[PDB]
Every structure is written in C-alpha cells, then in structure tokens.
Amino acid sequence: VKPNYALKFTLAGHTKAVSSVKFSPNGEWLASSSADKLIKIWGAYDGKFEKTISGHKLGISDVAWSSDSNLLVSASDDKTLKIWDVSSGKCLKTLKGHSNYVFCCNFNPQSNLIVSGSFDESVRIWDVKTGKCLKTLPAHSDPVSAVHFNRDGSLIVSSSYDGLCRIWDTASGQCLKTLNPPVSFVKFSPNGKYILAATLDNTLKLWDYSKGKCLKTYTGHKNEKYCIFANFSVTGGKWIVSGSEDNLVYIWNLQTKEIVQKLQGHTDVVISTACHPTENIIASAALENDKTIKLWKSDC
Ligand SMILES: CCCCc1nc(CO)c[nH]1
Numbered sequence: 001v002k003p004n005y006a007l008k009f010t011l012a013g014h015t016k017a018v019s020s021v022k023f024s025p026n027g028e029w030l031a032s033s034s035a036d037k038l039i040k041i042w043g044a045y046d047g048k049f050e051k052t053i054s055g056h057k058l059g060i061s062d063v064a065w066s067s068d069s070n071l072l073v074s075a076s077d078d079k080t081l082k083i084w085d086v087s088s089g090k091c092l093k094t095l096k097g098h099s100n101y102v103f104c105c106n107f108n109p110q111s112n113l114i115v116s117g118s119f120d121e122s123v124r125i126w127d128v129k130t131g132k133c134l135k136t137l138p139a140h141s142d143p144v145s146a147v148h149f150n151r152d153g154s155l156i157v158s159s160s161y162d163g164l165c166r167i168w169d170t171a172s173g174q175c176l177k178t179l180n181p182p183v184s185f186v187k188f189s190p191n192g193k194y195i196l197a198a199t200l201d202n203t204l205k206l207w208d209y210s211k212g213k214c215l216k217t218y219t220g221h222k223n224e225k226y227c228i229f230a231n232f233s234v235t236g237g238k239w240i241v242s243g244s245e246d247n248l249v250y251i252w253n254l255q256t257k258e259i260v261q262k263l264q265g266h267t268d269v270v271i272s273t274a275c276h277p278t279e280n281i282i283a284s285a286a287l288e289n290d291k292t293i294k295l296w297k298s299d300c
Contacts, residue, residue: 001237002260003251003298005282009047010265011293013040018285020062020229020272021293024069027278029086031072032285032293033060039074041086044276047295053084055091061103066111071128073114075102081116083128093131097124103227104146108153108170115156117144123158125173135173139166145227146185150192157195159186165197167209179207184227190234200224204242206254220259222246226287229272236280236300243270249284249296266290 016035023030023044030042037060039053058077065072071092072084081095081102100119107114107128114126123139126132140160147158149170156168163180185198194215195207202223206216222245233239233251239260240252249263249270263282268289273282280298 001300003233003237003239003280003300005249005251005261005263005280005296005298007263007265007294008297009295011042011047011049011295012291013049014038014291016059016291017268017288018272018291018293019060021274021283021285022063022065023274023276023281023283024065025067025277026069027276028069030274030283030293030295031063031065033063033074034291035059035288037076039063039072039084042293044281044295051089053086053089055082056080061101062105064106064114066107066128067109068111071107071111073105073107075105075116077101079118081105081114081126083114083131093128095124095126095131095133097133097136098122103144106148108149109151110153113149113153113170115147115149117147117158119143121160123147123156123168125156125170137168137173139168140164142182145183146187148187150188151190152192155188155192157186157188159183159197163199165195165207167195177209177212179212184223185230187230189232196230196232196240198223198228198230198242204230204240206240216254216257218242218250218252218257221248221250226269226271228270229274231273231275233275233280233282235276235278236298241273241275241282243273243284245269247286247290249273249282263294263296265294266292
C-alpha cells in the first residue's frame with residue numbers, strides 16, 4: 001500500500017520565503033507565515049485566498065492554531081509573538097519577553113497556553129487571556145528549533161541546535177527527560193507516546209519517550225541546514241511526511257521506514273509540510289526561489 005498524492009493547487013501571494021503552513025483543527029483553513037512579515041489564510045479544499053493578517057515588523061518563522069480554529073499565534077524576528085482573531089484579522093495580544101527572534105510556537109489543546117522557542121535559547125509559556133509570560137525555561141544552550149505540546153498539554157517537547165531534545169512538565173516547568181548533531185525539529189506523535197526528531201545529518205528518528213529509545217530511522221532526504229517540519233499522516237495509511245533541501249516532499253511508511261512517495265514540483269527547499277486533520281491532504285511550502293504553497297490529495 002502506497003499513497004498517490006497528486007498536485008491540486010499552487011497558492012501564490014507571499015513575496016518572500018514561506019516559513020510555516022498549518023491546517024486549522026476544523027479542517028477548513030490553511031494558515032501560512034512568511035519572511036514577508038505576513039500571515040495568509042487559504043481555503044483547505046479549494047485553495048482560495050481568504051485574507052492577509054499583518055502587524056509584525058519583521059519576518060515570521062511560525063504560526064499555530066487554537067483548538068477551536070478561532071485564534072492564531074505567530075512567532076517573529078521582531079522578538080514578539082502575536083495572538084490574532086482569525087475572523088477579524090485583529091491582533092488581540094503582543095507577547096513580549098524574548099530577547100531575540102522567536103522561531104517556533106504552539107497552543108496547548110485547551111488553548112489557554114502558548115509555548116514559544118527563541119534564538120535567546122529559552123522556552124516561554126504564555127497565558128493566552130492576559131498575554132503575560134507565565135514561565136521562562138532556561139531550556140537550551142543554542143537557538144530553540146521547535147516546541148510542541150503532547151495530546152493533553154501535560155508535556156512540552158523542545159529541540160535545539162545544542163543537539164538536545166527535552167521533555168518538560170507543563171505545570172512545573174521542570175525537565176522530565178533529555179534525549180549530537182543539531183536537532184532541527186521535534187513533535188509528539190498523536191498518542192503522545194513517541195517523539196519525531198529531525199537532526200541536521202539528513203535523519204529523522206522516532207523515539208519512545210517513556211523508554212528513551214530510538215524505534216525508527218527515516219533517511220533518503222536532504223536536511224543539513226534548515227528547520228524542516230515533519231508530520232504523522234494518520235487519515236489513511238500511517239506515514240511520516242517531511243520537506244527536503246532537494247525541493248521534494250518525502251513520505252515514508254512509519255512501520256517499514258521505506259520511502260513510499262516523493263512529491264516533485266517545488267523549485268526551492270520544502271521548509272514546511274502539514275497533514276489535513278480528516279482528509280488525505282498535504283500542504284507543502286518552499287523558500288524564496290519558489291515562495292508558493294502546494295496542496296496535494298491522495299486516495300489513502
Ligand atoms: C526561517 C525558516 C523557519 C522554519 C521553521 N521551522 C520550524 C520548526 O519548529 C519553525 N520554523
């Protein structure tokens with residue numbers, strides 16, 4: 001069994017490198033962030049441009065949705081995160097505290113908290129309602145490449161160029177576990193038992209969190225430079241999805257570790273991929289020679 005992702009839409013409009021694409025939890029929208037300082041909202045199913053959300057003074061490296069699909073958070077080189085009302089496009093809160101570029105962000109499942117990672121080497125936990133910083137974790141000794149909450153928000157996982165992945169107790173801010181090439185991306189599996197980690201030696205690893213053991217390795221792609229997003233595809237077959245510095249989207253069989261598809265079409269590094277929550281749909285986005293988002297559809 002292999003997927004058969006085919007190109008459905010090319011989304012043009014960002015004037016510099018795209019940095020991150022994320023599907024709304026309700027499956028309706030794609031949000032994109034860019035070095036052009038803009039967030040753009042697109043129809044997930046028809047690829048139709050919806051709106052531009054603006055206000056950051058420098059490039060945006062990441063964007064994330066609240067669980068109810070009503071809010072976005074963005075992470076910017078202007079050293080702030082911003083919370084946006086998607087319907088109005090208005091900035092509700094500017095989260096101030098990082099002393100350098102904010103690189104990565106995510107809401108917890110409740111969406112009362114935001115976690116951020118920065119070049120300042122810290123992870124911050126923010127109150128969504130007040131916009132106040134609740135905790136500053138001295139998480140790493142180099143830029144923080146990724147931050148993600150587990151399924152119930154009890155844990156945070158962070159990755160860094162220092163070569164560490166760390167698991168934090170959300171409530172206390174205390175480090176429960178440390179798992180050395182730079183770690184360029186990390187996220188929990190949907191069930192929260194595993195962590196998917198990218199290292200800048202062209203390697204993805206599936207870690208059993210509780211055991212601290214490497215279960216799977218995915219190779220064949222190019223990743224020596226950029227913090228490329230990877231995903232668990234769960235809507236059809238159980239795949240691993242990642243961009244690559246050879247301008248392709250890679251899809252592996254999670255269990256066998258075999259490459260089952262490579263998606264051709266991008267004309268620069270595929271920095272970000274996202275899996276639709278209910279349909280067999282991938283969004284991919286590329287750096288400044290390309291600046292487009294592609295939507296792909298598969299039968300499985
Ligand atoms: C400038 C390109 C940034 C892309 C990016 N990758 C991640 C992984 O967490 C966050 N942002």
